[PDB]
Amino acid sequence: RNEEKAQREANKKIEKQLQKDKQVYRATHRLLLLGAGESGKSTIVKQMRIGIFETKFQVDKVNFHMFDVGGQRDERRKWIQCFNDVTAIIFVVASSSYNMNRLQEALNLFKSIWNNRWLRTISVILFLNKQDLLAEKVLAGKSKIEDYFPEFARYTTPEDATPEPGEDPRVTRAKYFIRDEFLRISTASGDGRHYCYPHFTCAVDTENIRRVFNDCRDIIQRMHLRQYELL
Amino acid sequence: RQEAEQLKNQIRDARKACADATLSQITNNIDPVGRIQMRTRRTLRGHLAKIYAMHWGTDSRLLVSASQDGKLIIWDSYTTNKVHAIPLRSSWVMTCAYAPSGNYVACGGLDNICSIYNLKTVRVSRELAGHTGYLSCCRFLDDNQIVTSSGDTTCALWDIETGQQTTTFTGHTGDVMSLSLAPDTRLFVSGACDASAKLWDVREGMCRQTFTGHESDINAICFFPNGNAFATGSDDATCRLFDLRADQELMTYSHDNIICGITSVSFSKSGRLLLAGYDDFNCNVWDALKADRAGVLAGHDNRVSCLGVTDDGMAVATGSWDSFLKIWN
Amino acid sequence: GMGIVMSLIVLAIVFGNVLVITAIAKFERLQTVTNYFITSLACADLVMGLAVVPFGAAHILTKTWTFGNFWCEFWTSIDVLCVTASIETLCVIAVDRYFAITSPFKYQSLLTKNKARVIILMVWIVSGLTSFLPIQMHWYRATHQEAINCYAEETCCDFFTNQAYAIASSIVSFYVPLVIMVFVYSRVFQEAKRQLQKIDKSEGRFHEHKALKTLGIIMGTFTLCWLPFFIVNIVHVIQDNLIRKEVYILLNWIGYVNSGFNPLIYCRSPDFRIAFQELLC
Amino acid sequence: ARKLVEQLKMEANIDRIKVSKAAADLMAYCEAHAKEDPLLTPVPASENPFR
Ligand SMILES: Nc1nc2c(ncn2[C@@H]2O[C@H](COP(=O)(O)OP(=O)(O)OP(=O)(O)O)[C@@H](O)[C@H]2O)c(=O)[nH]1
Numbered sequence A: 001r002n003e004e005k006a007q008r009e010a011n012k013k014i015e016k017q018l019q020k021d022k023q024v025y026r027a028t029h030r031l032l033l034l035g036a037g038e039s040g041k042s043t044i045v046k047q048m049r050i051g052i053f054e055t056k057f058q059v060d061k062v063n064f065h066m067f068d069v070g071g072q073r074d075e076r077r078k079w080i081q082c083f084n085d086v087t088a089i090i091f092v093v094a095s096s097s098y099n100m101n102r103l104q105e106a107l108n109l110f111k112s113i114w115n116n117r118w119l120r121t122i123s124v125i126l127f128l129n130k131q132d133l134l135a136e137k138v139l140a141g142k143s144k145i146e147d148y149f150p151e152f153a154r155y156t157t158p159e160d161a162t163p164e165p166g167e168d169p170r171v172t173r174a175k176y177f178i179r180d181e182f183l184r185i186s187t188a189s190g191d192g193r194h195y196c197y198p199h200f201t202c203a204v205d206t207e208n209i210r211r212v213f214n215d216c217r218d219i220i221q222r223m224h225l226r227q228y229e230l231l
Numbered sequence B: 001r002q003e004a005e006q007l008k009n010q011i012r013d014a015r016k017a018c019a020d021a022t023l024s025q026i027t028n029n030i031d032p033v034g035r036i037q038m039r040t041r042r043t044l045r046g047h048l049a050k051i052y053a054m055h056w057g058t059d060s061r062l063l064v065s066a067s068q069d070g071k072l073i074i075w076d077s078y079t080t081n082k083v084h085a086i087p088l089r090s091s092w093v094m095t096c097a098y099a100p101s102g103n104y105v106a107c108g109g110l111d112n113i114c115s116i117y118n119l120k121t122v123r124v125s126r127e128l129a130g131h132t133g134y135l136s137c138c139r140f141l142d143d144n145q146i147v148t149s150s151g152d153t154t155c156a157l158w159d160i161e162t163g164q165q166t167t168t169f170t171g172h173t174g175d176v177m178s179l180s181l182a183p184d185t186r187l188f189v190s191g192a193c194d195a196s197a198k199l200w201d202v203r204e205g206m207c208r209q210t211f212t213g214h215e216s217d218i219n220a221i222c223f224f225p226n227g228n229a230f231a232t233g234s235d236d237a238t239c240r241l242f243d244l245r246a247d248q249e250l251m252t253y254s255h256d257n258i259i260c261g262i263t264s265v266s267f268s269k270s271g272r273l274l275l276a277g278y279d280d281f282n283c284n285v286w287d288a289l290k291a292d293r294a295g296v297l298a299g300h301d302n303r304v305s306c307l308g309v310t311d312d313g314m315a316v317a318t319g320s321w322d323s324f325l326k327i328w329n
Numbered sequence C: 001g002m003g004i005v006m007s008l009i010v011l012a013i014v015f016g017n018v019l020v021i022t023a024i025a026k027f028e029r030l031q032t033v034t035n036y037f038i039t040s041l042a043c044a045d046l047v048m049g050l051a052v053v054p055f056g057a058a059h060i061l062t063k064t065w066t067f068g069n070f071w072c073e074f075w076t077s078i079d080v081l082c083v084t085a086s087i088e089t090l091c092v093i094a095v096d097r098y099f100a101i102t103s104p105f106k107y108q109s110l111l112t113k114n115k116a117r118v119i120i121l122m123v124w125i126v127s128g129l130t131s132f133l134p135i136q137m138h139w140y141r142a143t144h145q146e147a148i149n150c151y152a153e154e155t156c157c158d159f160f161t162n163q164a165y166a167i168a169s170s171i172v173s174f175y176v177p178l179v180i181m182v183f184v185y186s187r188v189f190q191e192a193k194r195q196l197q198k199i200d201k202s203e204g205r206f207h208e209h210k211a212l213k214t215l216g217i218i219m220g221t222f223t224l225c226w227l228p229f230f231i232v233n234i235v236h237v238i239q240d241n242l243i244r245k246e247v248y249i250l251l252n253w254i255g256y257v258n259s260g261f262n263p264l265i266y267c268r269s270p271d272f273r274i275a276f277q278e279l280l281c
Numbered sequence D: 001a002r003k004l005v006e007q008l009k010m011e012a013n014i015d016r017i018k019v020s021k022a023a024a025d026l027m028a029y030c031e032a033h034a035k036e037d038p039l040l041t042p043v044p045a046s047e048n049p050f051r
C-alpha cells in the first residue's frame, strides 16, 4: 500500500522538474547550419562566436541555439527528417566559385532542400559568402560568367537595385544575377508558407549575428500573421 | 570479373525451381479472423517533443521511450505513472533499448555514440565510440555485449566491459535502418537503404543469405516467432514476408488506396496478425496467412514512428510525433 | 407568427455554442491557450441564449409577466451579467492577438495556461459584480411614479433606472472595451501592411485586402450589433419622452443576436472544420 | 571484386526446401499456438490488467 504512495511522490517530483524544463525548452530558438564545402562556413561560425557541433549565443536576452552537422556527410540525406521543427535553416554558398560546376551543385542542393516533404514550412536564410573574390574575378578577370552560365547574356539589371557606393555596374550585375538565380527557385513553389532571405557577406563583416535575429523575428511575425488570416 | 551475372542468374533459377505453389494457394480454406476492434486503454503524457523510439520491458509492465527534447522516461503501464527521467548530453536521439535483465538502458542518436545507463546503482556507465555515422538501432544481446547498426553501412558487436568492437559486419551499400534478433540470439537480420535485407551470423561474423524484394528503402524489420521467417516494411507502402529455408518471399501486403510510407512492423504471439504503422496518422492490422486487413488503430494526430508488442502478448503500444504514447488492447 | 422567429433564434444560439464547446472538449489538439477565451465566450453566449431569451420572448408574447418580482430581478441580473461578460472576452481575445503579433519573442512567457485562468476568473468576477450587487440591492431603482407603480405590482417587469447606473454600467460594459479594441486592431493592421511591403520589395518582380476584409468583418459585426443600444441607453435617461419603449426593446433584441454570430467568426479555422467533420457528420 | 565473387559463391551452395513445406510449417505453428494470444482471442476482463 505504501508502494503506491512512494510511486506517487516520485511522479510528483518528476512532473515538478518537467515544469521547470518546459519553460527553457520553449524559450530557446533552434537553427540549422547547412552549407557545401569551401563555402566559408567555419569563418562565419567563428565570427559569430566572437559528429555534431552546438553553439550558444544570446542577442537582446533571446536564446539562440545553432547546430552544425559534419559527422554524416553523404549525397543521400536521411537524417534531415529530424529538423522539421527548427525556426530557420542557414544556407552558406560561395558566390565566387562559379567556375571552380560548384555553383550549379549548390543550386541543385538548394532545390532539393526546398522541395522536401518534411521541410514544407521551414524558411531559409541565404548567405552569399566571399564577396571580394567575386569582385576580383569580375573586375579585369580572364574568365567570364558567359561561358559557364549562358543565361547571363540576356540578363538586365533590375531598376530597384541599391548598389553600395563606389562599386562598378559589372559586379552589381553579377551579384544580382547570382541572387536571382536562387530567388527563381525560391519563388516557384513557395505557396506563402515559407520564404527566403538572401544576404551578401564577406570576411570582414560584423552584423551577421544581428541579421539572423532580424530574420527570425520576421519569420515568427509572418507565421503569426498568416495563422490569423491577415496576410 | 563479369561472371557475377551468371551466379545471380543461377541463384534466381534455383530459387524459382523451388516455387511449387504460392502461400495463398496453400492457405485458402482457412476461416478468416474477422473484424478486430481495439480501443485505447491508457494514454501517457510528459514528452515535450516528438517520440522516435520505445522498447517494452521483459516483464510486460515497464517500458522506455525517447524524444527529441533529450530525455528518456521509464513508464509504468499498469498505474500510468513515471519512474525515471534521464536528461541527455545530446538532444538528437533515434533509438533506445531496454536490457533483458532490466538493469540497463541504452540510447543512441545523431552523435556517433551509444550510451548505456545503470538503473540499479542513474548515471552513465559506458560510452561506445567507433561508428562514423549516426546510429539507427541497438539491441541488448546480453548483459555484457550489445549489437548496433549505424548509418555508415556497418554493424558491430560491442563489448561493454572493454568498449572495443569485437566483430564488424559489412556488405550493405546504403544506410542501415533497423535490425532484429532471433529468439535464440544466434542470428540477426538487418534492413538497409539499398532495398535489401541480409542474414548475419553473430559468432562467425559473415553473411549467410540476401533478400532483394523491395524497390525502396526498408525502414522496419521484424522476426517471426517460429524463427524461420521475417517481415519488412518499406516506403513503397508494401510489407513482404520472406523465409529463411526457402530463400524467397511468400506474400505481399498492400492496398491500392494507400500510398504512404511504413515506419514500423511487429507480429503477435501466434504470428497470425501483423501490425504495421504508417505515415497516414494511423496503424493497420493485417492477416499474415491471407493478406487481408482486419482492423484499424486510429487516434494519433501525427505520424506513427514506434510500435511494440509485449512478451505475453497482452497489449500493443504505439508512439507518434504528437508526443503521446497509447496502449491498445 | 413571431414565435417561429424567436424559436429559430433560440435554436441557432444554442446549437452553435454547444457544438463549439463539445468540439473543444472532445479533441486534445484544440486545447490551446487561445481556445480558453473562446470557451468562456461560448459559455456566456449559451447561458444567455438558454436563460434570458426564452423568458423575454414569453414576456413579450404574453404581454404579462407571470412570475414573481424576485424572478424578475433574477432575470434582469442574469441578463446584465451575460451581456457584460460576452464583450470583455472579445476585448481579451483582441489583446491576446495584439501580444502575439507585436511581441513574437515574448509571447510564450507572457501567456501561460495558469495566467489565462486568472484572467478569465477576474473577467467573470468584474462582470458579475456590476450585475448582481447593485440589482439585488435596490440602488438601481428609479424615483418617478411609473417606476414605483410597476415595482408595487407583481405582473409588470420593466426596466427603470436612474442616470448614475445607466451611465456607469454602459461605460463598464461597452465604451471601455471599445477604444482598446480599436487601438489594438489599428496596430495589427499597421504591422500587416509593413510586412506585406517588405515582401513586395524583396520578391515582387517574380510574383492589403485579406487583412482589411477580416478586420472589417470582426469590427463591423460587433459595432453594428451593440452600438445603437448603448447610445439610446444613455439617451432615454438624459432626456425623457425621446425614446419609445418599443424602440428600446427592439434595439436590445438586435443586440442579443450577436451571440449567434461569434462561432461563425472565431471558429472558422481549418482545424475547427476538421473537428466539426469528425463528429456529428 | 574477388570478395564479392567469393560471397556470391558462398550464398549459392545452400540446401533449399520446397515452399509448400514452408507454408505447411507456418500454418501448423499458427494453428498450434492460436489459443494463447490475447489480442486475437478476447479474454475476459477479469484477467485484463488494463481494465
Ligand atoms: N576574402 C575572403 N575570404 C574568405 C571569405 N570567407 C571565407 N574566406 C576564406 O576561405 C578560406 C577557406 O574557408 P574556411 O572558412 O577556412 O573553411 P572552408 O574551406 O570554406 O570550409 P568550411 O570549414 O566548411 O567553411 C579561409 O581561409 C577563409 O579566410 C570572404 O568572405 N572573403
Ligand SMILES: CN[C@@H]1CCc2c(ccc(O)c2O)[C@H]1O
Pocket (backbone or CB within 6 Å): C076, C079, C080, C083, C084, C159, C166, C169, C170, C173, C252
Ligand atoms: C433589460 N435589458 C438590459 C437593460 C440595461 C443593460 C443591458 C445590458 C448591459 C448593460 O450595461 C445595461 O445597463 C440590457 O441587457
